[PDB]
């Protein structure tokens, strides 16, 4: 099985998982550790922001790849924002900071 682009999950916009569904392989925590073992930071940033999570970014990446630019705009992984709401739904005020 191999997946280029297809279905995306609703609650978090990560791609679906499975064979009967046009889903992609799961990049587990061990793979993240292995990537960190090398100095690969751009690889990790792409793999966990553009390929999977950042909804706006993964389209701008698509255009560039078709355009032949090979440049990514990471933005912020949408799933993370969801986490914030799950914590903001409690009596916890967690927020981003400028400085």
């Amino acid at each position: 099985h191999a997946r280029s682009t297809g279905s995306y999950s609703l609650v978090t916009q990560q791609p679906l998982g499975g064979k009967a569904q046009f889903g992609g392989q799961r990049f587990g925590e061990m793979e993240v550790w292995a990537l960190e073992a090398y100095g690969a930071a751009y690889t990790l940033q792409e793999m966990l922001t553009v390929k999977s999570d950042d909804v706006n970014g993964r389209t701008k990446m698509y255009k560039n790849i078709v355009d032949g630019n090979h440049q990514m705009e990471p933005g912020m992984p949408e799933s993370f924002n969801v986490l914030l709401k799950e914590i903001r739904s409690l009596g916890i005020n967690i927020e981003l900071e400028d400085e």
Binding site: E36, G39, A41, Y42, Q45
Partner: peptide
């Protein structure tokens, strides 16, 4: 990440500051 090429980027940012 603050390691590897990410460390290089962060170090450049901190030195140019």
């Amino acid at each position: 990440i603050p390691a590897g090429t990410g460390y290089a980027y962060h170090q450049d940012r901190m030195r140019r500051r």
